[PDB]
Ligand binder design. Structure first.
Ligand code: 7AR
Lengths: 425, 425
């Protein structure tokens, strides 16, 4: 409702930046208009001329001469228009966000293609956080989020979580420290936002439920904080039905959502996108305009043509192929865990994503059990310390990836792990 | 010599971020080592499988199965190793920087590939600037640089410039506001850095001279400030011998240089690179680690393989073709201007780049002459207002691009402008 509350002075001071009134007054005027006003380098000097890219379960992608010149040239900061248009329709299909037809100033849905979803998240954090601001999230969390938040000088307030994600009663108790009207009085610093990964949290593998999302949203309205929905595993849910998203229930216009193709189409191409209230997305776009300028035009065209040939049906058929693969990998690593972790450890079934989160019994810290004893036995799993704000505290947890390993490799790996737990007790 | 002086609290607080101890303890240990510690998604689900990219004056570039899988997956934040090593050798060949073998803490030359050179520049500004800080640069300046600096709250101090770039006497006079020893006393805020585009300034087309660079460098030592050498037109100089760069005379380790392939190889692939003192480059790398993560692996491999097949010889042959083209366009737009600007305007001959800077005589502000009268006559050139800190002040200057226009188009465009000037005198 009042987005200025969530925008630092620096972010608010931004104004629009280059490649401006050159390819828009010429993108509608007569074909006889000469423009020596543009800052674009002549693409005929560029040495790549054509491209052919083969696709599994899809038409081969071809960049002819003119399409290649476009791919090698600057493009809009928010993304190329045909990709933004497809993605917007996808978001309407998947989430029917309440904000689609709101006035801009009151949170009309808006999209920005980013150079990876993490770029969008970083610029969102920078847009909002003043030193000393309070922010809410569940630990353990993606180490990259914690390392992004650390230098911004916010107080991270841990919200309790279990196998169903954030626990609303913990969030409610935390918020009781304030009165709601304090959100209109910045003197005692009500939380600016809540961040969470609602599906297949890295490292736990846990997902939020529909009912807790609703509860959490009512509290976000009551104390007027934003929800940053970081959902890179959204297209990797193993349940029959995808849980409704925060975006899908965002009647106020207080959700900023991050999507990624990093886990399902390509991480190396650095393509993700933000969906959120237009006034906040605009502040991110202005920062992009003085930073990366835009995501790679070449990589956007690769993905846009892939998606447009697939149609929504072919895209969703791809995600079902990826769901099939990761859920079978999940079944395999759970079988190896049941097999070898013998009442030596505890774990919850991952609801989505690509990680299994193992609590080792009878040991207070495992990073000495792994980085010393396990490495020379030819096995490595990631100690859980790195996923907490205080990464020096002891952690009995290990994060095990099931994205790649064969059942044979899982059997050997959990064999070795079992031996190292027993001889350490 | 004291780099902490040039690093903000936030920037200094950054710690090294993900994709860490997984592909380095496995990149040297035995191949019998199993790792479930890694976080990488399975590239076999990614739908692009092979690529063939044709090159003009070059061997076609082929991404086979394994190369494509690498192209589609995460890679190091500073860039892929073979691109970094090639570029490092290029910088040694072009600039022979005095810092190559310095100890890290006193400015050992280091490089970062960035997602466009502007990303590296932006993160350099963010690394350095506290609100209230004083910075030096010459106006008119790239509008993207002015829009980047404005929200950081620094006081921009304009240094005088002429057809030979920054005037050293002007820089010396401005600095006489402080005593040299004031640089070791942050209380009265000596300038943190001087920023300049030394070759083919956008919008003026002017370039610095060797003698002036040496003078400027001496002042940067005397008053102990950094030089940010933003040099995107370095490979578009019309002379036979390139002017030595600030980097080439940087015996103190106080130069941060930005290079770009945007103007000669591809703007759309978003590839640039920073060269500078290792302590400062490292701060930028850590910001990339929580932001874009890395430049497109696919696009880095395209460029890297092209560069490795060309060798430095093939690369320099390419730049000389492009110089030749742009120098002929320059000759052409100067002819048009001689022909139809009849003592109606003044201009200097551009020394590099792709722009001509035209001062209309007898008119105080041209943006009404262009955005109103010229548009309906079918001709567009860019008013100079956008290239100054105060973009509301009147400007008699126009920027005209000679990157693309045919001689016929130039002849028409300047005929129209001439008529408008004459009937607008
Ligand atoms: O680069 C990234 O964004 C991802 C890649 C990824 C892909 C699929 C599933 C999960 C992550 N990534 C992590 O989140 C992560 C955490 C830690 Cl603790 C380490 Cl040590 C390394 C990484 C990492 O590469």
């Amino acid at each position: 409702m009042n987005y200025a509350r969530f925008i630092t002075a620096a972010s608010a001071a931004r104004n629009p930046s280059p490649i401006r009134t050159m390819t828009d007054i010429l993108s509608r005027g007569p074909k006889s208009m000469i423009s020596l006003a543009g800052g674009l380098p002549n693409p005929n000097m560029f040495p790549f001329k054509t491209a052919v890219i083969t696709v599994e379960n899809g038409k081969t992608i071809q960049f002819g001469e003119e399409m290649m010149k476009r791919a090698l040239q600057y493009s809009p900061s928010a993304g190329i228009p045909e990709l933004l248009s497809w993605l917007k329709q996808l978001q309407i299909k998947l989430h029917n966000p309440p904000t689609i037809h709101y006035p801009p100033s009151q949170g009309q849905m808006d999209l920005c293609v980013t150079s990876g979803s993490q770029q969008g998240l970083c610029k969102v954090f920078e847009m909002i956080i003043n030193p000393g601001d309070n922010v809410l999230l569940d630990e353990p969390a993606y180490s990259g989020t914690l390392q992004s938040l650390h230098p911004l000088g916010c107080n991270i307030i841990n919200v309790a979580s279990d196998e169903s994600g954030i626990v609303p009663d913990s969030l409610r108790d935390i918020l009781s420290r304030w009165k709601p009207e304090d959100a209109k009085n910045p003197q005692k610093n009500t939380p600016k936002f809540l961040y969470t990964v609602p599906n297949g949290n890295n490292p736990t593998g846990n997902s939020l439920t529909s009912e807790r999302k609703k509860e959490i949203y009512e509290l976000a309205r009551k104390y007027d904080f934003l929800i940053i929905e970081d959902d890179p595993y959204y297209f990797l849910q193993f349940n029959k039905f995808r849980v409704p998203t925060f975006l899908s229930m965002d009647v106020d216009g207080r959700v900023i959502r991050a999507d990624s193709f990093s886990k399902i189409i390509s991480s190396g191409l650095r393509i993700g996108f933000l969906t959120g209230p237009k006034p906040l997305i605009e502040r991110v776009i202005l920062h992009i305009q003085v930073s990366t300028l835009h995501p790679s035009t070449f990589n956007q065209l690769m993905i846009s043509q892939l998606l447009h040939e697939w149609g929504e049906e072919g895209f969703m058929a791809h995600v079902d192929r990826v769901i099939d693969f990761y859920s079978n990998q999940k079944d395999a690593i759970l079988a190896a865990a049941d097999k070898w972790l013998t009442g030596l450890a505890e774990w919850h079934v991952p609801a989505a994503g690509m990680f299994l989160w193992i609590k080792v019994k009878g040991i207070n810290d495992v990073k000495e059990l792994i980085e010393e004893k396990a490495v020379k036995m030819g096995v490595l799993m990631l100690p859980g310390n790195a996923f907490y704000v205080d990464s020096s505290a002891p952690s009995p947890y290990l994060r095990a990836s099931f994205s790649s390993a064969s059942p044979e490799q899982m059997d050997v790996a959990f064999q070795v792990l079992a031996q190292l737990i027993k001889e350490s007790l």
